Amino acid sequence: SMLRLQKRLASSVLRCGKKKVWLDPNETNEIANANSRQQIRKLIKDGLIIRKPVTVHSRARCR
Amino acid sequence: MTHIVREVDRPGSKVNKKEVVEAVTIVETPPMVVVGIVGYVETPRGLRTF
Amino acid sequence: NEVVTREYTINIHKRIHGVGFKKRAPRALKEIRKFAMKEMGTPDVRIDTRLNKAVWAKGIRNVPYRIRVRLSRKRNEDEDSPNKLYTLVTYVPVTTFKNLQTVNVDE
Amino acid sequence: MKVELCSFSGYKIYPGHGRRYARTDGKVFQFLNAKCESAFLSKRNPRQINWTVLYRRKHKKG
Amino acid sequence: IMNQEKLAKLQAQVRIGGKGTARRKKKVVHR
Amino acid sequence: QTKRRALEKIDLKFIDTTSKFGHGRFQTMEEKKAFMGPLKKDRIAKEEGA
RNA sequence: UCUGGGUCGGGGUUUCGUACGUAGCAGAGCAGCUCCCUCGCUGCGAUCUAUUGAAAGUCAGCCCUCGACACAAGGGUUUGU
RNA sequence: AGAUCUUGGUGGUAGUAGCAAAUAUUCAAACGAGAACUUUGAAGGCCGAAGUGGAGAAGGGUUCCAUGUGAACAGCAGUUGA
Ligand SMILES: [Mg+2]
Ligand SMILES: [Mg+2]
Ligand SMILES: [Mg+2]
Ligand SMILES: [Mg+2]
Ligand SMILES: [Mg+2]
Ligand SMILES: [Mg+2]
Ligand SMILES: [Mg+2]
Ligand SMILES: [Mg+2]
Ligand SMILES: [Mg+2]
Ligand SMILES: [Mg+2]
Ligand SMILES: [Mg+2]
Numbered sequence: 408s409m410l411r412l413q414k415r416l417a418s419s420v421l422r423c424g425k426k427k428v429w430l431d432p433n434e435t436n437e438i439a440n441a442n443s444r445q446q447i448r449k450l451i452k453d454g455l456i457i458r459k460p461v462t463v464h465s466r467a468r469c470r
Numbered sequence: 471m472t473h474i475v476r477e478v479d480r481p482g483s484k485v486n487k488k489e490v491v492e493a494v495t496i497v498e499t500p501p502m503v504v505v506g507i508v509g510y511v512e513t514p515r516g517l518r519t520f
Numbered sequence: 521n522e523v524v525t526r527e528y529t530i531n532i533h534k535r536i537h538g539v540g541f542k543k544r545a546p547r548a549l550k551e552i553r554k555f556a557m558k559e560m561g562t563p564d565v566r567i568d569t570r571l572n573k574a575v576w577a578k579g580i581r582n583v584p585y586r587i588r589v590r591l592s593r594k595r596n597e598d599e600d601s602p603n604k605l606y607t608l609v610t611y612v613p614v615t616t617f618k619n620l621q622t623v624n625v626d627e
Numbered sequence: 628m629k630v631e632l633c634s635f636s637g638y639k640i641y642p643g644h645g646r647r648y649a650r651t652d653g654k655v656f657q658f659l660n661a662k663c664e665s666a667f668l669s670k671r672n673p674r675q676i677n678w679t680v681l682y683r684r685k686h687k688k689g
Numbered sequence: 690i691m692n693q694e695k696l697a698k699l700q701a702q703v704r705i706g707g708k709g710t711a712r713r714k715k716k717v718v719h720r
Numbered sequence: 721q722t723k724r725r726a727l728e729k730i731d732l733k734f735i736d737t738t739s740k741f742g743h744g745r746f747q748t749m750e751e752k753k754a755f756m757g758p759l760k761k762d763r764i765a766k767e768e769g770a
Numbered sequence: 771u772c773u774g775g776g777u778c779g780g781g782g783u784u785u786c787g788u789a790c791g792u793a794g795c796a797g798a799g800c801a802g803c804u805c806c807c808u809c810g811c812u813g814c815g816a817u818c819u820a821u822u823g824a825a826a827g828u829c830a831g832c833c834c835u836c837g838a839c840a841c842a843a844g845g846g847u848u849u850g851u
Numbered sequence: 852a853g854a855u856c857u858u859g860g861u862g863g864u865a866g867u868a869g870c871a872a873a874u875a876u877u878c879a880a881a882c883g884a885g886a887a888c889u890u891u892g893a894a895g896g897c898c899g900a901a902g903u904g905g906a907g908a909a910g911g912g913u914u915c916c917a918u919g920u921g922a923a924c925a926g927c928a929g930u931u932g933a
Contacts, residue, residue: 408882409890409931412917424904429705431716432892435881442917454715463709473643475628475734480724489629489733491643526839529778537830542875545895549877559777559840569893572878573707576894580875585827622778622839628734638745639755643736660743662786677788678823688823689757706893741832742784749782760824761781 408439416447421458429457471495522605525592527612527623530555532575533585541581548575548583556607560593564606571611588614590625635663635673637680 410430418425430438434455441450450456473493478485511520535551536544549567552575556565571589578584589609596606614620629642638659646664647657658664666676673679683689691699705713721727738744746752 411890411931414891430891432880435891437718438891439882449719453717453719454713457705457711457713460711472740473736474732475642475736476730476732479729489642528839531778531830533827534830546875546877555777561841567878569879573894576877580877580895617779619779621837624839641736641738641745641747642734644738644745659745678786683823686819710893739783741782741828744784756823760822 427459560607562607634659
């Protein structure tokens with residue numbers, strides 16, 4: 408299906424950009440049923456939606 | 471193609487009795503097999519295969 | 521047989537000699553697909569994500585010269601498919617390419 | 628079969644190969660290819676180039 | 690208890706990307 | 721053929737057989753081996769072959 | 771076909787120039803260890819030597835394999851004095 | 852029959868020019884009859900804070916946001932869309 412709405416909502420709830428938002432490709436069907444921010448909060452806590460870490464930009468070379 | 475080295479047998483030339491290099495082309499020529507004969511006959515319109 | 525899997529190595533450098541900078545990796549993947557079609561006879565080819573990562577490991581123009589792949593001709597009998605056999609290709613990481621032969625690997 | 632010369636690298640130069648260079652001071656040099664000539668014209672010491680024969684005998688390689 | 694086959698399939702599920710990416714922490718289904 | 725260029729005896733002093741696949745500098749395998757001495761590949765080949 | 775052609779592997783050729791790692795009573799020196807050592811021992815240290823004419827590419831439009839692998843008497847359209 | 856006549860319609864050109872400014876996409880999977888253009892994940896890229904970012908004024912006025920459609924449009928396609 409299409410998860411354009413869910414990823415935008417997930418970015419809003421997680422307070423991070425859409426780049427960091429990870430949606431479980433396996434459980435696509437379960438996420439498609441989520442249409443409200445309240446459901447997204449359940450999925451984030453349940454682990455189906457995961458905030459990816461910031462890309463590493465080391466300053467050790469500069470130091 | 472490759473190059474060779476040879477003498478010169480040309481009197482009156484600046485290269486006579488001197489070593490020169492020359493470009494040569496190699497053509498591999500295996501022996502050929504003859505498998506037939508055609509005869510031609512002359513006509514007022516040219517040679518034609520008799 | 522019609523199920524056995526094998527291990528090959530591919531001269532990606534040879535098959536991508538002459539391709540422009542912005543098409544070297546996609547052309548490499550297309551040639552891998554054609555190679556998989558050649559030795560297997562199966563038009564259905566699935567390229568593994570790890571193999572795709574190995575192909576694109578050094579960017580888009582510096583594709584690795586050789587690759588070590590594993591073809592597996594499995595049964596496509598999971599749905600109503602025109603072809604009953606599909607070739608799944610995987611990537612086998614190796615340290616060197618010297619003296620590497622094509623080997624029939626068991627299941 | 629002609630008089631065989633030696634290069635910057637010390638390699639043997641066969642007839643019909645390489646180039647000959649004559650300077651203004653009168654010294655004549657010959658090179659096997661452009662790589663030796665480029666090395667010579669750039670003023671690079673042959674005793675610090677690994678594949679040069681002079682280097683091989685300087686370090687007694689072989 | 691967790692056995693070798695369960696850890697072997699956990700090896701498949703736990704990876705969500707290539708080298709340098711984070712590891713999945715949990716996957717729980719609830720109604 | 722009656723010109724001096726034609727009917728002229730040709731005798732070859734040397735024929736180049738160097739590596740045309742680049743910039744060759746050796747004529748024969750034996751000459752190259754004699755000039756370069758033993759190499760790592762032959763050393764390990766004899767190491768395995770005893 | 772007295773099999774054939776491929777894909778790898780090898781060798782030859784050539785191009786560049788001596789790979790990583792390891793060792794060094796080599797290295798401008800510097801900072802720590804002195805019952806110590808009687809001239810020393812531990813780290814940082816570009817570079818230099820042996821390993822090493824090494825490492826790597828090499829037909830995709832280079833050459834020889836008789837090494838391995840699998841494939842190749844199969845497909846479709848027509849043609850009559 | 853004319854008037855570079857007025858209006859409307861149709862040809863040759865012709866399946867032709869072209870669909871070439873700003874580096875670049877790729878693999879697997881899902882729904883789907885249909886995947887290069889939809890979505891998810893992975894890889895590789897770009898914008899490089901005077902941005903292809905985040906917000907306003909003027910102006911547009913419902914394009915905003917959900918659900919459904921594959922009639923017409925998005926000069927190709929679309930499971931998508933201002
Ligand atoms: Mg040549
Ligand atoms: Mg080879
Ligand atoms: Mg009229
Ligand atoms: Mg009239
Ligand atoms: Mg008119
Ligand atoms: Mg056109
Ligand atoms: Mg165009
Ligand atoms: Mg950039
Ligand atoms: Mg903006
Ligand atoms: Mg909208
Ligand atoms: Mg359109």
